[PDB]
Amino acid sequence: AKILKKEEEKKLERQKKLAEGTEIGEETEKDDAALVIKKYWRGYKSRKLVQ
């Protein structure tokens, strides 16, 4: 029930934000996610090789 209440609150907040005509780039989000994942994977490889 608390999770559904939080979901409703977040849905209301997102609807209010969209009512302001805010455009969020979606192509760059995937690139940022890939870059972060690659950095973390390379760091994990370095650490595993270190141990």
């Binding site: 940022d32 890939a34 950095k39 973390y40 490889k45 370095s46």
Partner: protein, 185 residues
């Protein structure tokens, strides 16, 4: 690593520790002639020391800032110490928080099923941002799947948790020694 909210003595000791860790990593990654290391492992040394600079960032702001005016086929401790000393002091190449990885994985999983197809993740890795090699993608699939050969999807949450724990352990390993070094009389 470096705390800029400490005393002058603390800042100096942190800098000297950065210098000595740079020296340790360089010596452990010197092959034949003491005082020289290939630039390929320079990001490898940084990862050994916790820094997470991107390949483009490493090539554009790391190597030129440490390479000589005359192109030197390998880098020596001279430009290797102060560079990442200042980087750690300013935390130039600190990786994002784990929430960044969580958001990245959620974005890659548009449907939010809790896992991402191996084919899709490999497509992102080899076609978006800094592309990985085939063997790198194989290793990523192996680890994210817990070395599962027949796995088709990966639970990004468990992988993120394991990566965070391993990063914390390696950070404990590296930081151990971050502390003492004192001005010699």
């Amino acid at each position: 690593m470096y705390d800029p909210n400490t005393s002058q003595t603390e800042k100096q000791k942190q800098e000297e520790f950065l210098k000595l860790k740079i020296q340790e990593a360089f010596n452990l990654f010197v092959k034949d002639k003491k005082g020289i290391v290939d630039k390929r492992e320079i990001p490898y040394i940084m990862r050994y020391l916790g820094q997470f600079p991107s390949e483009a960032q490493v090539r554009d702001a790391i190597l030129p800032e440490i390479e000589e005016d005359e192109p030197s086929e390998f880098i020596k401790y001279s430009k290797f110490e102060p560079y990442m000393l200042k980087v750690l002091k300013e935390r130039e190449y600190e990786p994002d928080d784990p929430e960044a990885l969580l958001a990245a994985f959620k974005l890659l999983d548009q449907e939010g099923k809790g896992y991402i197809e191996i084919d899709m993740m490999k497509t992102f890795l080899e076609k978006q941002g800094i592309e990985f090699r085939e063997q790198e993608t194989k290793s990523f699939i192996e680890f994210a799947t817990n070395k599962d050969p027949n796995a088709t999807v990966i639970y990004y949450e468990d992988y993120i948790s394991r990566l965070q724990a391993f990063t914390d352990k390696h950070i404990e390993s590296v930081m151990k020694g971050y502390n003492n070094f004192q001005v010699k009389k």
